[PDB]
PDB file of C-alpha atoms in Angstrom:
ATOM      1  CA  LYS A   1     -66.905   1.261 -46.376  1.00  0.00           C
ATOM      2  CA  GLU A   2     -64.432   4.039 -45.620  1.00  0.00           C
ATOM      3  CA  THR A   3     -62.334   3.546 -42.473  1.00  0.00           C
ATOM      4  CA  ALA A   4     -62.163   6.256 -39.878  1.00  0.00           C
ATOM      5  CA  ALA A   5     -58.429   6.251 -40.722  1.00  0.00           C
ATOM      6  CA  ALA A   6     -59.191   6.930 -44.378  1.00  0.00           C
ATOM      7  CA  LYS A   7     -61.872   9.496 -43.634  1.00  0.00           C
ATOM      8  CA  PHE A   8     -59.184  11.365 -41.621  1.00  0.00           C
ATOM      9  CA  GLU A   9     -56.827  11.188 -44.606  1.00  0.00           C
ATOM     10  CA  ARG A  10     -59.593  12.393 -46.942  1.00  0.00           C
ATOM     11  CA  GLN A  11     -60.772  15.176 -44.677  1.00  0.00           C
ATOM     12  CA  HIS A  12     -57.371  16.404 -43.372  1.00  0.00           C
ATOM     13  CA  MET A  13     -54.251  15.329 -45.258  1.00  0.00           C
ATOM     14  CA  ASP A  14     -52.792  17.321 -48.160  1.00  0.00           C
ATOM     15  CA  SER A  15     -49.147  16.397 -48.218  1.00  0.00           C
ATOM     16  CA  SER A  16     -49.013  17.908 -51.765  1.00  0.00           C
ATOM     17  CA  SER A  17     -53.254  30.031 -52.901  1.00  0.00           C
ATOM     18  CA  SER A  18     -56.426  32.050 -52.208  1.00  0.00           C
ATOM     19  CA  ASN A  19     -58.132  29.387 -54.363  1.00  0.00           C
ATOM     20  CA  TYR A  20     -57.263  26.293 -52.267  1.00  0.00           C
ATOM     21  CA  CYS A  21     -60.071  25.943 -49.754  1.00  0.00           C
ATOM     22  CA  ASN A  22     -62.886  26.290 -52.374  1.00  0.00           C
ATOM     23  CA  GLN A  23     -61.468  23.595 -54.576  1.00  0.00           C
ATOM     24  CA  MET A  24     -60.172  21.245 -51.900  1.00  0.00           C
ATOM     25  CA  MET A  25     -63.313  21.430 -49.753  1.00  0.00           C
ATOM     26  CA  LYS A  26     -65.161  20.374 -52.957  1.00  0.00           C
ATOM     27  CA  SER A  27     -62.571  17.787 -54.147  1.00  0.00           C
ATOM     28  CA  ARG A  28     -62.507  16.170 -50.740  1.00  0.00           C
ATOM     29  CA  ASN A  29     -66.306  15.953 -50.658  1.00  0.00           C
ATOM     30  CA  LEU A  30     -66.823  18.274 -47.743  1.00  0.00           C
ATOM     31  CA  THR A  31     -69.355  20.364 -49.714  1.00  0.00           C
ATOM     32  CA  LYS A  32     -71.434  17.443 -50.856  1.00  0.00           C
ATOM     33  CA  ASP A  33     -74.403  17.522 -48.422  1.00  0.00           C
ATOM     34  CA  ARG A  34     -73.869  20.861 -46.746  1.00  0.00           C
ATOM     35  CA  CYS A  35     -71.143  23.457 -46.579  1.00  0.00           C
ATOM     36  CA  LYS A  36     -68.950  22.070 -43.752  1.00  0.00           C
ATOM     37  CA  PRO A  37     -68.361  25.253 -41.667  1.00  0.00           C
ATOM     38  CA  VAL A  38     -64.578  24.754 -40.886  1.00  0.00           C
ATOM     39  CA  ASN A  39     -61.875  22.275 -41.803  1.00  0.00           C
ATOM     40  CA  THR A  40     -58.136  22.008 -41.643  1.00  0.00           C
ATOM     41  CA  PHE A  41     -55.646  20.434 -43.971  1.00  0.00           C
ATOM     42  CA  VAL A  42     -52.181  19.305 -42.990  1.00  0.00           C
ATOM     43  CA  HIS A  43     -49.263  19.682 -45.413  1.00  0.00           C
ATOM     44  CA  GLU A  44     -46.918  17.154 -43.911  1.00  0.00           C
ATOM     45  CA  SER A  45     -46.335  13.538 -44.563  1.00  0.00           C
ATOM     46  CA  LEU A  46     -48.786  10.879 -43.579  1.00  0.00           C
ATOM     47  CA  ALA A  47     -45.934   9.342 -41.570  1.00  0.00           C
ATOM     48  CA  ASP A  48     -45.260  12.530 -39.646  1.00  0.00           C
ATOM     49  CA  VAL A  49     -48.922  13.041 -38.944  1.00  0.00           C
ATOM     50  CA  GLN A  50     -49.412   9.407 -37.793  1.00  0.00           C
ATOM     51  CA  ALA A  51     -46.397   9.709 -35.470  1.00  0.00           C
ATOM     52  CA  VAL A  52     -48.439  12.351 -33.615  1.00  0.00           C
ATOM     53  CA  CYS A  53     -50.351   9.437 -32.082  1.00  0.00           C
ATOM     54  CA  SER A  54     -47.312   8.796 -29.944  1.00  0.00           C
ATOM     55  CA  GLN A  55     -46.456  12.440 -29.199  1.00  0.00           C
ATOM     56  CA  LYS A  56     -47.869  14.761 -26.516  1.00  0.00           C
ATOM     57  CA  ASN A  57     -50.976  13.288 -24.844  1.00  0.00           C
ATOM     58  CA  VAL A  58     -53.541  15.981 -24.061  1.00  0.00           C
ATOM     59  CA  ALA A  59     -57.282  16.168 -23.441  1.00  0.00           C
ATOM     60  CA  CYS A  60     -59.699  16.191 -26.385  1.00  0.00           C
ATOM     61  CA  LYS A  61     -62.264  18.901 -26.573  1.00  0.00           C
ATOM     62  CA  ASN A  62     -65.002  16.330 -25.901  1.00  0.00           C
ATOM     63  CA  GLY A  63     -63.319  15.235 -22.701  1.00  0.00           C
ATOM     64  CA  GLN A  64     -61.906  11.938 -23.982  1.00  0.00           C
ATOM     65  CA  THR A  65     -58.185  11.348 -23.335  1.00  0.00           C
ATOM     66  CA  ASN A  66     -56.975   9.996 -26.741  1.00  0.00           C
ATOM     67  CA  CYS A  67     -55.701  13.280 -28.200  1.00  0.00           C
ATOM     68  CA  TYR A  68     -52.135  13.986 -29.141  1.00  0.00           C
ATOM     69  CA  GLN A  69     -50.389  17.309 -29.845  1.00  0.00           C
ATOM     70  CA  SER A  70     -47.456  17.555 -32.286  1.00  0.00           C
ATOM     71  CA  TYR A  71     -44.106  18.435 -30.641  1.00  0.00           C
ATOM     72  CA  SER A  72     -43.175  20.344 -33.772  1.00  0.00           C
ATOM     73  CA  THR A  73     -45.198  22.931 -35.639  1.00  0.00           C
ATOM     74  CA  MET A  74     -46.729  21.784 -38.888  1.00  0.00           C
ATOM     75  CA  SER A  75     -47.883  23.537 -41.983  1.00  0.00           C
ATOM     76  CA  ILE A  76     -51.627  23.583 -42.241  1.00  0.00           C
ATOM     77  CA  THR A  77     -54.433  25.387 -43.983  1.00  0.00           C
ATOM     78  CA  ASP A  78     -57.645  26.419 -42.266  1.00  0.00           C
ATOM     79  CA  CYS A  79     -60.702  26.655 -44.482  1.00  0.00           C
ATOM     80  CA  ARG A  80     -63.441  28.808 -42.896  1.00  0.00           C
ATOM     81  CA  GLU A  81     -66.797  29.278 -44.594  1.00  0.00           C
ATOM     82  CA  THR A  82     -67.463  33.019 -45.526  1.00  0.00           C
ATOM     83  CA  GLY A  83     -70.789  34.607 -44.440  1.00  0.00           C
ATOM     84  CA  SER A  84     -71.535  35.173 -48.164  1.00  0.00           C
ATOM     85  CA  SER A  85     -71.283  31.424 -48.899  1.00  0.00           C
ATOM     86  CA  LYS A  86     -74.487  29.733 -49.948  1.00  0.00           C
ATOM     87  CA  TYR A  87     -74.779  26.000 -50.500  1.00  0.00           C
ATOM     88  CA  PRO A  88     -74.161  24.456 -53.043  1.00  0.00           C
ATOM     89  CA  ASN A  89     -71.672  27.221 -53.840  1.00  0.00           C
ATOM     90  CA  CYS A  90     -69.699  26.813 -50.688  1.00  0.00           C
ATOM     91  CA  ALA A  91     -67.315  29.777 -50.156  1.00  0.00           C
ATOM     92  CA  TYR A  92     -64.146  29.526 -48.078  1.00  0.00           C
ATOM     93  CA  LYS A  93     -61.604  31.820 -46.585  1.00  0.00           C
ATOM     94  CA  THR A  94     -58.256  30.065 -46.930  1.00  0.00           C
ATOM     95  CA  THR A  95     -55.574  30.660 -44.322  1.00  0.00           C
ATOM     96  CA  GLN A  96     -51.978  29.315 -43.969  1.00  0.00           C
ATOM     97  CA  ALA A  97     -50.180  28.876 -40.692  1.00  0.00           C
ATOM     98  CA  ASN A  98     -47.574  26.730 -38.953  1.00  0.00           C
ATOM     99  CA  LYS A  99     -48.898  25.424 -35.647  1.00  0.00           C
ATOM    100  CA  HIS A 100     -48.971  22.367 -33.494  1.00  0.00           C
ATOM    101  CA  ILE A 101     -51.794  20.038 -34.428  1.00  0.00           C
ATOM    102  CA  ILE A 102     -53.938  18.019 -32.057  1.00  0.00           C
ATOM    103  CA  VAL A 103     -55.492  14.732 -33.310  1.00  0.00           C
ATOM    104  CA  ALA A 104     -57.550  11.965 -31.684  1.00  0.00           C
ATOM    105  CA  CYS A 105     -56.180   8.530 -32.352  1.00  0.00           C
ATOM    106  CA  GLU A 106     -57.729   5.092 -32.219  1.00  0.00           C
ATOM    107  CA  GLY A 107     -57.343   1.534 -33.473  1.00  0.00           C
ATOM    108  CA  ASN A 108     -54.784  -1.132 -33.805  1.00  0.00           C
ATOM    109  CA  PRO A 109     -52.658   0.256 -35.376  1.00  0.00           C
ATOM    110  CA  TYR A 110     -53.123   3.545 -33.514  1.00  0.00           C
ATOM    111  CA  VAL A 111     -53.730   6.188 -36.044  1.00  0.00           C
ATOM    112  CA  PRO A 112     -55.335   9.587 -36.330  1.00  0.00           C
ATOM    113  CA  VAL A 113     -59.084   9.427 -36.693  1.00  0.00           C
ATOM    114  CA  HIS A 114     -60.100  13.052 -35.902  1.00  0.00           C
ATOM    115  CA  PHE A 115     -58.650  16.603 -36.072  1.00  0.00           C
ATOM    116  CA  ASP A 116     -59.313  18.206 -32.727  1.00  0.00           C
ATOM    117  CA  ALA A 117     -57.518  21.555 -32.887  1.00  0.00           C
ATOM    118  CA  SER A 118     -54.408  23.524 -33.743  1.00  0.00           C
ATOM    119  CA  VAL A 119     -52.399  25.629 -31.352  1.00  0.00           C
TER     120      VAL A 119
END
């Protein structure tokens, strides 16, 4: 039984090229039952990302209040599915950027359970 905390780590953490999204979307199991349309990976430490749960409190896109925006920019990769992609050969446009991330956090201890957005 995978925790929400772990599913966040699996779906969104890569603390370690044009190739990256195709592989990593597969490796992280996000291509397993459908081609997940969009996903972001965060190239920062687990510790830095978890500290976001005590950084800037902002509204979540679903209207809940447990979202937190990173005071610093962070290195991330957006994977966006290309219009030529057909399941089970999921095709992704990889893109780098440094931006502030926004995560929803929950639990005791209070940790990131969902990637809301990047700005």
